[PDB]
Design a protein around this nucleic acid. Structure first.
Lengths: 51, 103, 50, 51
RNA sequence: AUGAAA
RNA sequence: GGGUCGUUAGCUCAGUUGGUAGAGCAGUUGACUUUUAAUCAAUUGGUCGCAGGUUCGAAUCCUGCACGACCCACCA
RNA sequence: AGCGCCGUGACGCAGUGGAAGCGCGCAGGGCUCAUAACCCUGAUGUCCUCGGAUCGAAACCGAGCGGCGCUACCA
RNA sequence: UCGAAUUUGGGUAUAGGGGCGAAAGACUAAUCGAACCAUCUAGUAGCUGGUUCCUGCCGAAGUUUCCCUCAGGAUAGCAGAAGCUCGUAUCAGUUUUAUGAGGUAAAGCGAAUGAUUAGAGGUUCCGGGGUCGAAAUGACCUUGACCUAUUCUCAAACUUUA
RNA sequence: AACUGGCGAUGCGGGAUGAACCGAACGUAGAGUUAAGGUGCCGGAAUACACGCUCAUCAGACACCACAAAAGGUGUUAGUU
RNA sequence: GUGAUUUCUGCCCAGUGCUCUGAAUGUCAAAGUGAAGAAAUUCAACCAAGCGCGGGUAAACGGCGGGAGUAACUAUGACUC
RNA sequence: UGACAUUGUGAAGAGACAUAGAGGGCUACCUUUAUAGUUUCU
RNA sequence: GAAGACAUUGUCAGGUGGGGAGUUUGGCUGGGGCGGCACAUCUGUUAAACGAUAACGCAGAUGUCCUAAGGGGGGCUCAUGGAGAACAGAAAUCUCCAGUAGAACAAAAGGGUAAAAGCCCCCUUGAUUUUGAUUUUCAGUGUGAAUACAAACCAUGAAAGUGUGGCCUAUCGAUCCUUUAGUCCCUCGGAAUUUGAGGCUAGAGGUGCCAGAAAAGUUACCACAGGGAUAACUGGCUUGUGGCAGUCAAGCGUUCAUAGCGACAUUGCUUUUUGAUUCUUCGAUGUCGGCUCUUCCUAUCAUACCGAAGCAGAAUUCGGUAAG
């Protein structure tokens, strides 16, 4: 069985769990997107896409 | 996969029975009613001691759903379903596939 | 030093508690072996401050 | 598992306090009339170890 | 801040 | 006792997997300085532990051969 | 023996198919009598090697070369 | 070890997932990682063992598919029994005639693809160059390519043939 | 794993011996004739006939089967140029 | 929990626990409230503790790293990154 | 921990619900103010 | 005296709760566990020229992708090479010649295709409805995929024609439940209307252990039914590995391949190691070493007799009969 230690990415919070090596564990479908940046209004960041 | 917003298809509607124009829309799974017999029986079945009484499913594998449509006849308003294959990404707003383009 | 049947610390090839000894006040009768409802632990250095 | 020491000391078969060599309870005389309107004299006759 | 031997 | 790795300038280390030994330390001379030190330039050292195939042809290909550097070695 | 990871400037460590980041280190100028520090500037990465897929990879998949890790229990 | 956290009689308390434990899962009436007694109970067993007279006739399978299925079942097959409709044929683990299909053995690589050995003869607007010379698609020589025809060996996932 | 045949479920005759090989498959008997295997003695059957090879101071002896190889020998025989 | 005396108890509150805040558009049951409907009922708001957010705590459970470069022989590395 | 019941007799504040008026980035708020009833914390 | 409509107590609802209870903790497998998926499938080969055919056999692949990358029609021919054309070179764009496919067709691989199935262009949604028949896997059951027609309505094309998804081989899912579309049809059983619920036909939400349970560990304190179907001792077949002996001779040995050694190569032997297999044994063959004590083999360390030497003597090496 596997002990896992992983960092919450949108929060910064450690998460340790453990479960057998052959049992199924869920994964999301993470994506990076590389957005360009324009003039920042109130606290909301301001990113555009190519199209 | 991508689909347009309107489609010419058969309407078994008792006056068309031929190819008419059909507004397409997706199929949304629909809010669940209470007082359907399964929910009534299930609330009775869970009423009291015994713990969980019906199975509950976790050994999950499918990372995709079948996409399903509703076809509204322009003349009769006769809805109709037809199903498509499995797709991760789906879209109705169609920016067309231009072949002659760059990266 | 007891067996795991006899206490909530017992057992193991090494004499070790294993699960932390600071016990909730809203625990039950059978779990309240150890340091119960504690606010701080360890050596106090300074004053009782009262 | 099994019942444990405090969880049996509550029931108290062999953990009841010993009483053979005690002089009874130690108490203040009853608040009858004198201790709430005046006073009363008493004599310390003896002093004794309580076990 | 430091500044080779006679 | 085997399986692997390597023994290159006085010292140390790349080497090139086949045709040429290169870098640093060291030493010698020169420049520098009042002379030295350091610093700069130039040369010195190299069959690279003994025989095979031999790329036309071999240090490095690998075959054995003396030095070293690791890994294994009843059993219930 | 079996399985897994990793190889990015001189050094350490990031790097996401449209194309290399930071710190240290290095060089040049200026202050200083000189070096250090300081202020103004610039550069250096076959992304271990070969092949493949891809319009094109350092990344993606095989080969090799190297440095590690994990298994090694019941007798 | 021996004046004590000592040794002991009698009474007395604590009762089974409970007691008691200076703690070994030890003790709890020769029983303790849950006492003993009775019932539910003839508990359940895909597992082991056994399964009672004679003779005659026929006579197997360990294979298909599905099962938290692999020591077991269901199904199909193999085999018995009951027969039923007709009476020499609407058959055959066979041969012959005629017609099809295969791409394995074998064979081939001066035939495609992939791998491979060695020469010669050329083309140098032609890779590296060594020379004649200022150089010149000028000239010569050597050495890796490419071209020509040749040679030697191969292929379960190559092939004309077969 | 493929095809076929056997053993399991199968006795008899042979292979000394043996589940499978060889021969042949079985009612109870009698008479003959054979199979595979054998005919010195054990052992029923010729110490038969015929042509040659071999002497071995660890011979060789009959399928499956119970092993034996590379390399050699002026031993001996028959051959080739 | 630790186990006479002597000496000494270092650094880590990120995780799991324990505990103390509430200043909060988070989550938030039943009962209760409002709206729709003819009613069953539906929808919305509010919202206790708890959970989430944030402090404290290691004589609480427990944890306490690698890689490079450099010294006037070489090696080593006080030093630096 | 919350609701109802047990469970009666009293008040003093405060918050919100609908109407109207001012301060704000055709106009949505937020800051406030004055009302007749309605709930809820102290 | 205290305290007071709070506490308490009763009933519901939310939390906490291995303190306590119940239960589970896949299968295949050269023993099991770790590992892996050979568990649902696809290509080529093994596979022995019909079909079928195994192993934890080999090299791979799938849980996706496309309103076009589907359907039709029309016009062109690709990869690559040669010869040229400023910048422009090996590689930018253009033209000519050859070009049976050496390209491209969503991907793995294999087939297939040259006025096309490829590339471009034009128009479309036959990726539509009703349901039956058939092939493959096969029990001739289902799922999935595909084939050929019928009745309709269409697309495309001048037209024959072609078209029920992708050029073919893979790309996916039962019951119960929930939900949606159709008929606006049936019922709610004393008679009606309207909500609501239950029905019929057709799809989705998902079971990847893929003919489909809802599921973590440990036991050296262990228990039971069994198993030599299955491991760890010994034995048996095998001898990689361990060990021993031969064939040949490049070389070493002052000169010389063999006195003694003998690389590169190769044929054997033994079961004294250590593996591999699972035939016997799990209703038990007492399991390492030492002590004691016997016996056997020889591949002889010494001793007896000999042979050879780079053996003058001594000492030593090689070798024969030899296990007394």
């Amino acid at each position: 069985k596997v002990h896992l230690v992983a960092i919450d990415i949108f929060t910064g919070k450690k998460l340790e769990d453990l479960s057998p090596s052959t049992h199924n564990m869920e994964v999301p479908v993470v994506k990076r997107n590389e957005y360009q940046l324009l003039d920042i209004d109130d606290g909301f960041l301001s990113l555009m896409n190519m199209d | 996969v991508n689909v347009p917003k309107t489609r010419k298809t058969y309407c078994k509607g008792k006056t068309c029975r031929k190819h008419t124009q059909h507004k397409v829309t997706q199929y949304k799974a629909g809010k669940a009613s209470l007082f359907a017999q399964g929910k009534r029986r299930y609330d009775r079945k869970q009423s009291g001691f015994g713990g969980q009484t019906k199975p509950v499913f976790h050994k999950k594998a499918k990372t995709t759903k079948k996409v399903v449509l509703r076809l509204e006849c322009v003349k009769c308003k006769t809805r109709a379903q037809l199903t498509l294959k499995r797709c991760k990404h789906f879209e109705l707003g169609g920016e067309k596939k231009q072949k002659g383009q760059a990266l | 030093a007891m067996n795991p049947v006899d206490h909530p610390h017992g057992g193991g090839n090494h004499q070790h508690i294993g699960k932390a000894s600071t016990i909730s006040r809203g625990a039950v009768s059978g779990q309240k072996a150890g340091l119960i409802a504690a606010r701080r632990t360890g050596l106090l250095r300074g004053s009782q401050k009262t | 598992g099994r019942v444990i020491r405090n969880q049996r000391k509550g029931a108290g078969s062999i953990f009841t306090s010993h009483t053979r060599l005690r002089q009874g309870a130690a108490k203040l005389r009853t608040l009858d009339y004198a201790e709430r309107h005046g006073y009363i004299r008493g004599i310390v006759k003896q002093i004794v170890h309580d076990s």
